[model samples]
Each structure stands twice: as structure tokens, then as C-alpha cells.
Target: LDVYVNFPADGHVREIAKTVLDGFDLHWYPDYYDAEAQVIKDRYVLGKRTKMIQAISAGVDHIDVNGIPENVVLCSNAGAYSISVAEHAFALLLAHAKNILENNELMKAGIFRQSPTTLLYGKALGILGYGGIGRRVAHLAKAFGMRVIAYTRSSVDQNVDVISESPADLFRQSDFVLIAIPLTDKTRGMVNSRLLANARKNLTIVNVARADVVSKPDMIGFLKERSDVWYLSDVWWNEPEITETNLRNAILSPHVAGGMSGEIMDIAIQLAFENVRNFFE
Candidate 1:
């Protein structure tokens, strides 16, 4: 009957207000504690009315899962930001493949350097994780005439051309590999030196996932050792304050793969509400 929305009931929320809140009563304040651990000032009386807790972020890793009540339905809005992140991944990939950055710098230097650039067509793209972002990337890759192979923990994706037997095998077979897995106990530092050493020449390893998945020291060492390979990533270890800035083989972005803050806020808020509304029925 009632739901607690994470986003403020502002102009953005007002736009989709009628559509999502047809039958259910949408409360701006929480009856108990907030879903993402934010404590609001206003509270309802002893009788709890908030049945669903909808989160605004795609990831609930920041949220304390145990803190949320078992009876209350807590939705994460996972697939909401998948397309945005996947598109950004392609932006990074296409930029690296075509030497866009290097040439742009050369343009400023009054040097028109003509060099053979990598092509997305007829090349193998190995996916490290096959979640929402990974699946979306595969869908986009097909339009560019690229072959997709994946290594996922779960069931095989019908979209992929082939499934790699192991992670190392994924590196060996792919011309480029995109990382999209979650950070887990077993997955930490999984993309270390041993796996990287098996990579093909000029292999571009795109890291849109968590940074710790690739060992900080090992990645630095690997970049220094292999100048042919590229490490295009959205995040790095201990981000927003990266200590090193001299890696020539690395192309970095400040974890902005899922669009700007306002864009995500708008999309996630509406999506969370929609999920709650659909599930509520």
C-alpha cells in the first residue's frame, strides 16, 4: 500500500509521479531507517506503512543488506544504468582502437601523424563478466560486426558467439577484453600478472568494473613491461586520489562510465519507482 522512495520528491520525481504512483501511496520520508543507510529526520508513528524500500543506485554494495528488514521488499535498480555504462565502455574502446587521444594531441602539436588504427569489425571481444553491462556491450558489439566471447559464472548468454572455459583462456583468445564482474572474495586481484602475461599483442583490457579485480601493483608492473597492450579503465585502486600518473599504456576515466550524477539520479529514481510499482502488483 505504501513505499519509501530514496530520491527527493523534486521536479524530476514529479514528472513521473502520476504514472508510477497510480495505486500506491509514495512517501518521501522513511517509516524506519533509510534503505541506503541514510537517516531521515521525520518519521511515522509506531504503525509501519512502508512496505517497499526502493534504492536509487544500481549497486546495493554500499547498502548494509542485513540492516534492511526481511519482510520489506528492497529493490536495487540494477539494469537501470546498464546501457549508459555499456555505451561509455564502447566510447572508451572506440577511442583507444582508433588512437583518437594520440592523434588529438598530435593535432595540437601541428603534427598529422598517420598510423594504422585497430578496427572493431571482425575482431574478437572477450567479456570478463556477463551481467547487465556485459550483455548490453555484447548487443552493441554485434552492430559493429565484432565477435563476442564471454566468461561468466552463471548460465551461458545466447548473445555470445562462444564461452571461454576459464578466465586465462579468455585473455589468450581475445583481441580485447571488457571487465564487468562484481568484486567478491574469490574475484579480488583475479586479473593479475599470471593472467595478463597470456594476453595477445596490442590487447586492450577495458576495466569498467571495480579496480581491485586487477591487482594495483601487478597492473602497474604489467603496463611497464608490455608497451603494446592498453589498459583503458573507468576506475583505479584507491580512486579520486590516484598516486601514479605516468602509465603510458593506461587510459583513465574517473568512474564516470554510468553518465553524470543528475542523469543517473533521474533514471534510477524513476526506475526504482517503476520496479516498486510493478512488483507491488
Candidate 2:
């Protein structure tokens, strides 16, 4: 199992990377720079002994899928951050529904006033892409006494009380909507103005999925038009600047939904190690 690690040698994560591949024939490159820095692409001349590439993250959208050699395998660390991501999704949902941030600001200013807040109990929660993270979100939503419905290409699960036939159906039925799908050719700009227009009034939307899953310009337009609709996103488009229009109904996070802690890395590394070992089988 001769493998090359595309990581800085001095880092703490690299120490774990070293330990994970200790028993195997390992190789570490100083740096994969320029176009070579693209971790999923072919950066170096591979020997016959090189077996696979173990990616550190779940998605490979930034990866050069076409550049990899046909014989070399590439595997991502999927399901490793499911719990953390799900928890983050719910945190965003709760924040928007209960007006946590706004209330906190009022409290800080010594204005102790009670305001109307939405509760999750008995509400419909629409989950998009019923994968690992989506299932966990449904589990949590159910625990809060919310009914879980899902929109997925796969077979329906009994826990999900209803299966939405389309995006419009899911939007129309749910008070709280969670988007957890991956970004792909077909999924790009899938959540557009038409679908958003069908959403329930005063809908609270949380997106732990890729930002591109919802069309950026379209979402900005929709959010501006419907001040009642609240969108809390873990990822934002062009994060550098927020326009006055988007600032109205959008709450943005710095894409740190997947917990950036030692515990997370340990789980991801373990899964990647297991994947590499599984490749040998």
C-alpha cells in the first residue's frame, strides 16, 4: 500500500495521517502546488504499487475527477461528520425559529421584552436528500415532536412520515425545511424561485448542503421579496460581501457546520483508514 499524502508535514493532523498509514509503505510529498495542489487530480507520476487516495473531506466537488488514472482509486470520508453536521443544521433552524440572535441583542441592551416565537412541536420538517445527515436530522426533528417528511430519489423510510413527490410538495408542506443534498450536474440551481415561491409563509430554511444547491441570485431575490421567509445557511455564496437585499432574511455562517475539532478529524481519519484497508479486500 504505497500512498502519497498531500498534507503539510509539520501539522498535527499530519501526525495522525502518519500514524494511520504507519504499517503501510507510505510516501509524503512536500507540497502539491499550482494545478497539482488539486488533491483529487493526478499530481505525480504513479508507480504500479500506488493503490488509492484517501480524501480528508466528504465531497469532491473541487477535485479533478477526470484527471485521475483509471487504475487508481479515490475515496472520500463520507458519514464521518454526520452527527456534527446534523446538530449544526438543527442549531441554525432553532436560531431562526426562536429568533435567538435578535433576542440576545435585545437582552444585551437591557430591553427585557417577550416576543412571539415558533415552536418545533407538531410542525412539519421537510428533509431533502435522505442520506446519513438527513436521517440524523429527521431523528432529531422527531425527538422535538416535529413530523418528518422527505424528498429523496431513493426508497422511502418508515420513520419519514411522508414522502414528498417533488421539491414544490416539500416546500408547500413544511414549516421548517432542511436541505442536505450533494451538488452535482443535475442538482445545480435545483432550488430556484418557482420552488421557493411554493414554500409555506414564514418558512424557516436551513441549508447544511452546498450553497449552489439553491441558486444564489434567485435565493437573494426570493428572500428580499418575502421578508417572512428566513434562511440560515452554513455556506454562503462569495462570502466576501453581503448585499443589502440578502442581509434582510439571510443568516450566514462561515461553512463550519462540520465541527472543526480534534474529535471530528479522528473519526474522519479512522473512516479513511478503514476505506483504504477495504480497498485491499
Candidate 3:
């Protein structure tokens, strides 16, 4: 049996996989995901009921669960990409508020201004969830002169200054609210118009984690209705074919915020190795 890796592998993880695979009887090779490749992989898994599939990257939304055989377990290396992703969450939050895009546009247009842009200094930054990414974002925000508050299911750790509060209070006090929580059952489509509408001052929202965290229609409605609030994110619900009809308020990119480098391949390979080990045990 051979393990089919569905994502591009960086040199680091590829070396690791090569070392690890020598210990196993089954062979392993890399193949980037495509429609045709997915079908082939599905057939391969089904043909060998004992063969399990492992994704080299995170975000399983693209995965076709129905196409995968039940006997073949599926796993992802979601944490391998955390540091790069956590850094981006903080990077976008500052870029969106401090006018990163605008400054670039002005410089490109030969309209550079001598005046310095506004600062996020002394303002409050709210995080929707107090997870690994969110905690990292809050720590970065503090170093950048922002007070941090977070929403979570459990009591926050004592080492950090994460304040507990209702969503309404977070909105009212936050100058920028960053969405960094995982996209789970309770959190999917939770950030909506009501939270934005109730905010005391126009707040900036940065969603670097998931697009489904915010309801598409309601987010559009809020952006169309209010100019005070702004959004900056790498992921969006409607992508690859975003039409002109979409509101231009929210700052969006082609889901590249995780990192600008090819390190994602390393993440995928790590996940594959972990899955293979789990199967052996």
C-alpha cells in the first residue's frame, strides 16, 4: 500500500516523511489535490479497506467526506501551521486598521503623504474566542498598544490579561474585534449584524481563521448599512468568483494570510506522518 498525500509538501516535511516512511512497509508519495486526483484517491482507499487517508494541511471544508471510504480514517495536521497563521492574524489586524492597503495604493499612485497614519495605541481590541490563535493575537495586540479582551467557554489563564465579558460588552468597548476561533458547531455563522450594530463606536473586524464564522448575507448587510465598521481578512465565503455585486467594505485576499511562503507543504507532510503513526499504534 502507498499513502497518497493530497497537498504540496515543503522540503522540511518531505525529508521527515521520507525518513519516517522507511520504517513502514507501505510506500508514500506527494500529489496535490485536484478533482481527478480526489476520485483516484477515493477509489484507492475503497479498493483497500485497510488503507487510511491523511491530509497534509488544515481546513477540511474542501474534503468530500462521502467520497472517502468509512474504513479509511482521515486526519489533518491542523496545528503544524499555527505559528504562521497566528502571526498573520496579528498582521492583518494591524494592516487593516493602520491603512496597509491604502498606504500601498497611495505610494503606488505617487501620492505619499508626510503625515503619519493613526495608531491603535491605547484602544481596546476584542477577540471572539480565547483559543491558541486568539491568545497569540491578543499578546501581539498588547505589544502594539491595545488592551485585550476575549470571549471563551472556559476561564482564561492567569498569565495573560484576558477579560471576560458578554459579546455585547466586547463590541461596545473594542476598537478592533479579531475573529480567531476555530469554526466549530457553536461558532459557525455566529458573528453577525447584531454584534456589529450594537457596537458603540465603529469597530474593525478581522477574520483570519474562517469565513463561515460570519454569515455571508448578514455581513454584507452590515457593511452596506454601516461605513464605520471595517473588515480585513484572507478568507471569504464567496471566493475565486467574487463578483462586483459584493460590498467593497471588507478587506479580503485570496486566502493567503496563513503565510506568504511555501511552508504549508511542510504542515501537510507533518500531518501525514502523525496519521501514519496513529494507524500503526
Candidate 4:
């Protein structure tokens, strides 16, 4: 079977890909659009020989899914970075609660003082999605003695402390809200003013998921209206714009929650290899 890989030129990723595709007839295409075009037209005789396409990234939102023909099976490395992402999510939550950045800045300016900070223990953590990443976050939160409440795509119980009847219910009870849902037609802009209005005053929100999952305009408006609310997100609405006008009580990372650490990248490549093997079998 033939396999196609689209990933960065440099990095251990190429080495890992080489190891995975050792025996298979491999075609490395860095430009996904060209790869897609070739696949659609069955050019380079790939259409007939190629069995699967293994994506390096966890999210396939960038790929043109509909354009890919039915013959080619597409696979993603979804759970590969779950642990890394969950760790970052919790890190953001802890940073916001403990005012780590604020205190660091104060100390640098020669001001040494102790400020009362929030605690994760006994606090309600609302997980917006109950997928692999969310499950890991739930376990971490529970380990910290936090009450885990969740609202998944389904109404079925998720074995959490509380299964919220609706997103509003989750927002109403949670002291820290972690947005873990992907960007989809159903989930896009789902966390609007109506749902956010039910949140606890001075709530801490961390978004490790896609920024579009939360309504950009609604979040901006909400933050402006509620000064007490603290938002720490890996995803930002417009990163360049935030530089000009920094939002109060908000800390934004340049979408690096699922950082490509060696271990994380190894796991992702391993998963892709496994999928390719499974497809061939």
C-alpha cells in the first residue's frame, strides 16, 4: 500500500515519518492543496495505489474534507496530544487563579506583597466537551479535589460529579469553565451572551479549543461588560489586534496549548503509523 504524508520540512517529524513508512511506498507532500488536487484527479497514479492519508495535525479543519474522494480513507492524530493539551489547560486555569503573571510583574517592579488568590480545591470545573482531551482534564481536576461537571454533545451521563442539563447549567455552576469542544456547525458561537450570562461572577475561563467555538463578538462584549471575569486562552480572536487593545483580566497564549513537544509529536506520528497499518490490514 502507498501512503502520503504532509508535515513540516524540518524537525524530528520527518525522521518519525520515515520510520513509520519504512516498508510502504511513501509520498511526502508538504503542500496539502497540491496533495488534495492530485488525490481528486488520481494524478501521479496515487489515486489507484494510495490506501490512506495520515494527517500530522490533530484537527482536520484546515483540510478540504469534501474534496477528498470516497476511495481514500483519511485519518487524524486526535488523541496524540490530549495529555499535553489538558496539562496546558490546567496550567492556564492555575495561572489565572493564582495570579502568577500579575505577581511576577509586581515583584519585578520591586513590589513584594501577598495577594489573596483563588483555589482549585472544591471549585466547580465545567468541561464543555467530554472527548479524550476533556476526560483527561476531568481526571486532573478531580485529582485536585475539584468538582467536575460536564456538558457533552449527548444528554447521556458522563460519570462526572454533575451532568449539566444544558450549557447554561454548566456555566451557572462552574467557577472555572474550560472550553474543549471543537469548531463545528453546531458548536460555533454556542457560548453566546445567553449562556455566558448564567456564569458565576468573577468566573475564570480557559479555552484550549478553537477560538471560533466561542463567539468572538459575544466574548468581547461579555468581557467588556464583566470586568471581574478572567479569561486565559491559547486561542485568540485577533492576536495582532489584542496587542493594540489588551483586554482586562485576560491572558492569551499564541495557540500553543498542544505544543509539539518531542513526546507529543512522537505519539502523533505513532498514531498515524498505526492508522496506516490498520488501513492496510
| Residues 17-50, model 3: lDDT tens digits | 6776655433333433221111122123334334
User: lDDT, candidate 3, residue 246?
Assistant: 54
Q: Which stretches of candidate 2 lie over 4 Å from their true place?
A: 1-6, 9-11, 14-51, 60-72, 81-84, 143-145, 155-159, 182-190, 210-212, 215-221, 239-242, 258-267, 274-281
Q: How many backbone clashes does candidate 3 have?
A: 2
Q: Per-residue alpha-carbon lDDT of model 4 for 117-140, expressed as tens digits?
A: 998898899989887788888888
Q: Give lDDT tens digits, candidate 1, residues 171-222.
A: 8889999999988987899999999999999999999999999898888889
Measured by lDDT, the strongest candidate is 1
- TM per candidate comes to 0.81, 0.71, 0.65, 0.71
Candidate 1 Cα errors over 4 Å, as ranges: 1-7, 18-49, 61-71, 108-113, 259-264
lDDT of 2 by residue, 132-184 (tens): 88988888888999998899987666669999889889989999898998788
Higher lDDT: candidate 1 or 4? 1
Tell me, by TM-score, which candidate is best: 1
Locate the minimum summed-lDDT window of 10 residues in model 4: 36-45
Off by over 4 Å in 4: 1-11, 14-53, 60-73, 155-159, 184-186, 238-245, 259-267, 270-281
RMSD after CA superposition, every candidate: 4.3, 5.4, 6.5, 5.5
The whole-model C-alpha lDDT of candidate 3 against the native structure comes to: 0.64
lDDT of model 2, residue 126: 94
